[PDB]
Amino acid sequence: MSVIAGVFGALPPHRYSQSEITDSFVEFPGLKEHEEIIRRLHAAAKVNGRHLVLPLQQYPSLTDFGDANEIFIEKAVDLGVEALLGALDDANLRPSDIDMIATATVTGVAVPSLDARIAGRLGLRPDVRRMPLFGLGCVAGAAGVARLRDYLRGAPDDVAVLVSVELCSLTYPAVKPTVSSLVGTALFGDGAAAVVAVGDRRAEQVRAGGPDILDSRSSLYPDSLHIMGWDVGSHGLRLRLSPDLTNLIERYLANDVTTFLDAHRLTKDDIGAWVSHPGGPKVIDAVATSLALPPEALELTWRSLGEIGNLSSASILHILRDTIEKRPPSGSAGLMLAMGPGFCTELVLLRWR
């Protein structure tokens, strides 16, 4: 039932244009023959630029899972601590204040987990509570925020942090010129984000200025395991992405949104600010359509998609910060809407201050 005190985004310094990425990409080994479909997919992606953890031309040398995942660990901890620290300072808080840290990634395999490494780097208390969320994927931005409330609900004086870090480009060893993988090369970029939330009694104490987290609802769809996820192997984390995904949103999302807003005696028109995960144009349109939304409602997520691509779990937290910068009217409601491997959906009710 708590309150956000800090949101912060972090990106790798290497920034490229989509056209720059596409032009060099079609010149990679194995790939020139597929230039036509690559150019089409990358144009259709509605992404104009992406940040990457490695120099663009380093990727043809990134063939080994072991190398990729080791670079993942090094670079993910970096970005994660940069994201967290930015969030702490936005929240006028500091590492020793954190009672619990959550960590969301679907894009590398880290044991000891990321939270353990970030905790060691930023000097959080040895008794900090660790929640390593792996395999929630694109939904983990909303889901991590929900889990933070679930913690702070039972701890009103407490501070809890979520750090999302997604380095999609490092899954390159698993990438080959098949359609689904290539779709991936069109949308996904790298980035990280951190949310610092505080308990209700701690909220007055630290002048927590962000939105109130009022409630959440998970929604898991039957017989939809195959829709999204990885097919993990020796060449690494290989994307699975069915075309059927968009259809599932169109038939069931309106239902899940209306069933949830009802329980608060609100309807979707009472929502003053939408914060939706930017999966891709067809997806964003789908949630626009099925929810009968004006095109202004999802503008920030279209723009985030455009500027930095799809960041998996971190995207919705970037778009969340963008809307916090926008300063919606006080007392008005907001709704986080994320979806990913499951197939599932996550709704988080917000109240703007």
Ligand X SMILES: CC(C)(COP(=O)(O)OP(=O)(O)OC[C@H]1O[C@@H](n2cnc3c(N)ncnc32)[C@H](O)[C@@H]1OP(=O)(O)O)[C@@H](O)C(=O)NCCC(=O)NCCS
- Compare residues 130 and 303 and give the one whose CB is closer to a second copy: 130
CB of 245 to ligand X, least distance (A): 5
**Chosen from ligand PLM, ligand X, a second copy, none, partner binding at 109 (C-beta under 5 to 8 Å by type):** a second copy
At 32, list the tokens. Answer: 């020139």
At 289, list the tokens. Answer: 């359509």
Q: What is the DSSP letter of 328?
A: P
- Compare residues 44 and 71 and give the one whose CB is closer to a second copy: 71
**Rule CB under 6 A: is residue 173 a binding residue for ligand PLM?**
no
d(Cα 67, Cα 170) in Å, to the nearest integer? 9
Strand ranges inside 189-270, DSSP E: 190-198, 212-220, 228-233, 236-241
> Which region, judged by CB under 6 A, interacts with ligand X, from 40-48, 162-170, 196-204, 207-215?
40-48
At 294, list the tokens. Answer: 């004006």
**Chosen from ligand PLM, a second copy, ligand X, none, partner binding at 45 (C-beta under 5 to 8 Å by type):** ligand X
Catalytic hit among 124, 138, 187, 298:
138
307: left (phi over 0), alpha (psi -120 to 50) or beta: alpha
CB 249 within 8 Å of CB 263: no
- Compare residues 102 and 339 and give the one whose CB is closer to ligand X: 339
- Compare residues 114 and 253 and give the one whose CB is closer to ligand X: 253
- At 146, which amino acid appears? A
Q: What is the sign of the dihedral through the CA atoms of 49, 50, 54 and 59?
A: negative
Backbone angles phi, psi at 348, to 5 degrees: -125, 120
182, 341, 348, 352: residue in contact with a second copy (rule CB under 8 A): 341
d(Cα 300, Cα 296) in Å, to the nearest integer? 8
Q: By the criterion CB under 8 A, which residues form the site for a second copy?
A: 64-66, 69-70, 100, 106, 109-114, 116-117, 119-120, 124, 126-137, 143, 146-147, 150-155, 217-223, 225, 228-230, 232-237, 341-344
**Active site (catalytic) residues:** 138
Interacting residues with ligand X (CB under 6 A): 40-41, 44-45, 138, 179-180, 183, 186, 241, 243, 245, 279-283, 339-340
